Amino acid sequence: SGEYPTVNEIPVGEVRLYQIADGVWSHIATQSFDGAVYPSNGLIVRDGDELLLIDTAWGAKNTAALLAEIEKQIGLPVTRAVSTHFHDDRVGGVDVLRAAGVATYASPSTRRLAEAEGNEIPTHSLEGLSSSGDAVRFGPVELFYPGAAHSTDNLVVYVPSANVLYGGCAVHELSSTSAGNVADADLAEWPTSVERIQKHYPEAEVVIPGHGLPGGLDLLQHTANVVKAHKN
Ligand SMILES: C[C@@H](c1cccc2c(-c3ccc(CS(C)(=O)=O)c(F)c3)c(C(=O)O)[nH]c12)N1C[C@H](CCCN)OC1=O
Ligand SMILES: [Zn+2]
Ligand SMILES: [Zn+2]
């Protein structure tokens, strides 16, 4: 009923949307992984009379439920999707999207890592993002490659009309006590990558992590802090 929906509040298989700003929503779903349940976020950005999707809802059935929830709550077609790194919480559901008419995109680095890992593979490659600090426009957002952090391929997304910074899994929520799933992370480079984000998007008003609650710019410094302590 209005607060940001939380892990214990969403059954696995249901999706909820949360209005972030005019024409910007997050999507929230839950999934089981190695015997524990986790929430995860994505983004929806209005693109005239179409929608741009950032990240799947972590699985095929969750992503089908996402499309149904978008049609119920918004009623505009999802035409393009971008996955911000290669893990299942970002690409799991790409096959569902591709069968629902959605053109799926990711960097070549993400596509290679997804293919090598056995994860679902976005169709189209996003060039122009291979060097840290690179930025490209994609509909109503800017895509930014900050450098290696949670993964070597992680992208962040900025919505300039609303000053919304979607950090994806390179950014953690304020309540976090460690750096999440660090399997593919570069803990040494992560603070430098976060510093690049801070320098590039100083006017961000909302910061959305890959998992958990949105907040303000403090999420970036908090992320650096929990990562530095995890490495140590
Ligand atoms: C699918 C993904 C994956 C699965 C399960 C959990 C997560 C978490 C995660 C964990 C804890 C917290 C709370 S907290 C900040 O307080 O610790 C959190 F917010 C997020 C993340 C993430 O941190 O983004 N991602 C996960 N996977 C799988 C892949 C490894 C595959 C190797 N066989 O790597 C990866 O990330
Ligand atoms: Zn990940
Ligand atoms: Zn993640």
Side-chain angles (χ1 to χ4, degrees):
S1 301
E3 286 278 296
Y4 200 82
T6 69
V7 68
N8 296 290
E9 276 154 18
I10 302 170
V12 176
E14 316 204 340
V15 176
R16 288 292 175 270
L17 309 184
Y18 182 88
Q19 188 89 68
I20 295 284
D22 178 41
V24 185
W25 302 256
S26 66
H27 62 84
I28 313 87
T30 55
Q31 189 54 271
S32 175
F33 177 93
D34 286 25
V37 174
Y38 304 92
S40 83
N41 297 321
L43 205 70
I44 303 159
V45 184
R46 190 165 60 231
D47 177 23
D49 53 22
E50 304 181 357
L51 304 172
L52 172 64
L53 183 65
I54 309 300
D55 292 326
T56 68
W58 197 357
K61 288 175 86 175
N62 277 353
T63 299
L66 170 63
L67 292 176
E69 195 67 16
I70 288 171
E71 176 62 14
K72 170 175 182 180
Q73 302 294 351
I74 304 174
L76 295 174
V78 178
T79 55
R80 298 182 291 186
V82 172
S83 295
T84 60
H85 69 276
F86 75 101
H87 291 157
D88 197 43
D89 60 320
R90 311 294 134 193
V91 298
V94 152
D95 285 0
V96 161
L97 296 175
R98 171 166 46 236
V102 183
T104 59
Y105 294 82
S107 73
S109 179
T110 296
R111 292 182 77 261
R112 285 190 280 280
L113 294 163
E115 163 145 70
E117 191 75 34
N119 292 345
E120 292 162 46
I121 306 163
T123 295
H124 301 286
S125 297
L126 295 169
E127 296 301 330
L129 290 164
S130 70
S131 288
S132 59
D134 276 348
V136 305
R137 292 305 308 280
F138 196 90
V141 307
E142 181 174 62
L143 307 178
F144 180 72
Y145 176 52
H150 166 78
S151 64
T152 54
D153 61 321
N154 51 204
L155 300 180
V156 309
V157 179
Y158 196 71
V159 190
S161 69
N163 290 304
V164 173
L165 176 60
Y166 175 83
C169 300
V171 176
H172 281 290
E173 76 176 315
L174 287 178
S175 66
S176 54
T177 57
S178 79
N181 195 331
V182 298
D184 294 318
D186 184 336
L187 292 180
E189 201 55 43
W190 198 331
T192 301
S193 295
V194 163
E195 292 164 359
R196 291 204 186 74
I197 300 169
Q198 289 172 311
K199 178 177 171 134
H200 208 90
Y201 295 113
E203 268 60 78
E205 295 178 29
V206 176
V207 180
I208 303 167
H211 307 262
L213 308 183
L217 272 166
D218 275 18
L219 275 69
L220 301 182
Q221 188 57 48
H222 179 69
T223 297
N225 291 344
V226 302
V227 169
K228 281 143 178 168
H230 194 123
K231 183 191 325 153
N232 295 338

